[PDB]
Amino acid sequence: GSMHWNDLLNSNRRKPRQQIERDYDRILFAAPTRRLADKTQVFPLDKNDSVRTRLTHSHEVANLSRGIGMRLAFELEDDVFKDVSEDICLKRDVPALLAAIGLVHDMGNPPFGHQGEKAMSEWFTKNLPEHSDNYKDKIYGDFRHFDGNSQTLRLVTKLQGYGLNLTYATLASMIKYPRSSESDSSLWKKHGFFLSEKDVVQDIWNNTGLSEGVRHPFTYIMEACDDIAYSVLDAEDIIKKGFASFHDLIDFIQSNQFCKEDDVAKRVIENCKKIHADYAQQKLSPAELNDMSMQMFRVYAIAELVDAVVIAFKDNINEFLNDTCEIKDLISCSSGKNLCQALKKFDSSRGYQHRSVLKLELEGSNYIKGLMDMLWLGIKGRATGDTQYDTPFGRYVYGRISENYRRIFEQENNLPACYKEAQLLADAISGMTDSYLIALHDELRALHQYECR
Amino acid sequence: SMHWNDLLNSNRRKPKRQQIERDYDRILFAAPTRRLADKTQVFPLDKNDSVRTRLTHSHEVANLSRGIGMRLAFELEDDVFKDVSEDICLKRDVPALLAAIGLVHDMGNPPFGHQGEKAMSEWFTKNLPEHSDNYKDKIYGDFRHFDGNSQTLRLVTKLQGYGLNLTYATLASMIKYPRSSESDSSLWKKHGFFLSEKDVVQDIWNNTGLSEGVRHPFTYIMEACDDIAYSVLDAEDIIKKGFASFHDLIDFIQSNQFCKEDDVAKRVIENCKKIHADYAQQKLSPAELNDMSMQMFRVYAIAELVDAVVIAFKDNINEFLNDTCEIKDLISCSSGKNLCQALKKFDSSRGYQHRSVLKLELEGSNYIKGLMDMLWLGIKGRATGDTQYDTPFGRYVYGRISENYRRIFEQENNLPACYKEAQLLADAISGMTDSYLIALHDELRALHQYECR
Ligand SMILES: [Mg+2]
Ligand SMILES: [Mg+2]
């Protein structure tokens, strides 16, 4: 069985310019997209150094995906789009679809970078014990292993009961891991949607020809663009902040075990050496020379990695279009896997373990866990029938939660009451920016003095 | 007349996908583009509000321009683009070109909104007297009537002899007002480039078939998209911040003298009234109902204004391609001019004159003028020869200026010394963000205590 591009590019919407272009416009004009500007990506955003935030990273991923779609729809059309209905305009739909899924991919991630997800998962693991009878079911893993992709899908499908009313193609491409926490798929080790979205994704799977464990072909492209953006622009930011030099990056790539014989890595290194041989002649500050060489390396590396990803996607298009697809990621099957791995290693060694990043992660973990404690004081028991929340502090912290999250929490559905409370807490925490989370944590800590003692 | 072959010149100024797409890619990854996220657009940046910044406004304008380009290249190609070489791929160039010029249109604008430009102009008028023999030429008007478009062109052309190396089509499109301060024309009341770029612009005009007073056709589209974004999105921000309600906007449009018996305004009003009546049934908080109604109004108004702009551009394409074009703006020749004027009046009455915006403007003016005084203390005389600047405070404030601006200032050219010093100050002030400008102002004020008295 092979999936068809007519179903994968379904322009219909769940609620009973091209449609996909309108989807991209709605995603861009959405409030969470603008809120992404205040969410930390890797490095602290308080510093005035033009460091990457979630919004800038999302826009870069969207641009890379749009360029890949441009190449796919204009150059390699007959190679990958073999059987497409005439009413579908690939040149207008594919770039727009890739740009939209790139822009929206990190919309539901919690603040404070990766430490946000890690802290939420740790708090949920501690406060929703797996041995306890209330939180024994695997569905609560949705919070014990909380992931931003499921929250993003929930945000785009249930927050407004259809949300932004994205097309089926967009929603299908949003699902990064086609399985839930209840599922036991060996191919994917992470859940891609919550239990509350279990019906919705099913509807998507009923309109795009997809099923559990089967990924949309454009999801691979979006993930590859995300990985490329991470690996390249994190290194660029590392050099920009002065945590390392361009020569340090070149030496790290050259001395990497898998990049000594890698053709792409050697080509990039040679081109960067040639350019740096000319950039040093002009009178430039060491920071200025580092920035120039870093920009040139970014251009070369992004071009090479994007070309390798496009080639890999074109070569493995038949495997992607088949339901029995075992490809993990597009980078791993491409010729640029070694360079991307080396860049990720460099980013981990030089940027992710720097003093500033570690301090930011520690502060984010502290803030998130404290705020989750104070909010759980007012959330727990609301749906299970208990009354322990009915305190002035509990009422206040419940009133501080955004009204849409509370409205979804006070609804009739098959979700267990404990699951509803945990989902309310997760929705409240995930949608917060760094500054808003810190301010709310400080205010609640100030107001909690009597009840805490 | 003018041919599209020259207007869409993909050649780059520096002597030696698509080139024009590469222009948008380079603009997106530029550091000042990321710095735009820290510059206020109209309203101050809060910790919770999703008000537009310069970056979000630029992205919205770019999206609108890209949609216009898709409509022009995919539907109205025969009506708009006649006698175009088969080498030029309109479907890939026109949308990319419009998006690139929309994203870059506000790169060089000073911080603190429009008050930034106003404060820079007032300070330059006071400290560069027109009666003083040192400053009598019209060239110093470049600073007495400082404009963000000229600084944007300067940044893209002379900041990295070439900067981003944008194509000739892009550079021609970013010239909003095709005239200089020295040249006096009744067509345009503002200068579009500095004296230092006179040779660059003359080059661009040579490679695009344009001339003084003749504006690139896509500049009209970019300006129309900028105006539409300004009006509609500022109204949306006003509603979101709570300064006015959706019913207030509806009443203002209905009670507007020109918007009466206006087809576009009536259509938008009726559609929004029906949608609001439908929405009122759902139990939502007043803020939520206002947000939903304003979002639907934004969708309807943006669609109507964009369609009117497209129709006006298509109808007047022959005049736009003529060197004797007398059109001042695309909106005024469209059917949506009345709605745009009413929206601008509503924004001025409720948003721009709100106490928060007035306080932001006053603080920005104070900060900008104080910092300009303290920087002029260390800049003045560096090029004329007089050595009042050679003080520890002057040396420090000169060292705090960005190295690239200082390097351009120290270059030997035909610019007068006073012009070079004023341009150094303008480049320093314009490139700062709000927070960085405030921090530098506080630092210098702390360090200026002894030398002040
Ligand atoms: Mg990402
Ligand atoms: Mg603008």
Author numbering:
A (entry chain A): -1 to 14, 29 to 172, 177 to 469
B (entry chain B): 0 to 15, 29 to 172, 177 to 469
Article passage:
To define the mechanism of dNTPase-NTase regulation, we determined a 2.4 Å cryo-EM structure of the Salmonella enterica dNTPase protein. The Salmonella dNTPase comprises an N-terminal HD domain and a C-terminal α-helical bundle and forms an octameric complex consisting of four pairs of dimers that arrange to create an architecture resembling a four-leaf clover. The clover-like CloA octameric assembly is formed through extensive interactions across three distinct interfaces. First, HD domain helices α2–α5 interact between adjacent CloA protomers to create anti-parallel dimeric units with α2A, α4A, and α5A forming primarily hydrophobic interactions with α4B, and the α3A residue R46 forming hydrogen-bonding interactions with the peptide backbone of the α3B–α4B loop. Second, CloAAB dimer units multimerize through interactions between the CloAA C-terminal α-helical bundle helices α18C and α22C and helices α6A and α17A that interlock the CloAAC dimer. Third, the CloAAB dimer unit interacts with CloAD, forming pi-stacking interactions between α12 residue H263 of CloAA and CloAD thereby stabilizing the CloAABCD tetramer. Similar to canonical dGTPases like the basal E. coli housekeeping enzyme Dgt, the CloA HD active site motif H117 and D118 coordinate a catalytic Mg2+ ion along with residues H69 and D242, and the HE catalytic dyad H126 and E129 are positioned for substrate dGTP hydrolysis. Interestingly, in contrast to SpdGTPase, no activity was observed with CloA enzyme alone, suggesting that Clover dGTPase activity requires recognition of a cue that occurs during phage infection.
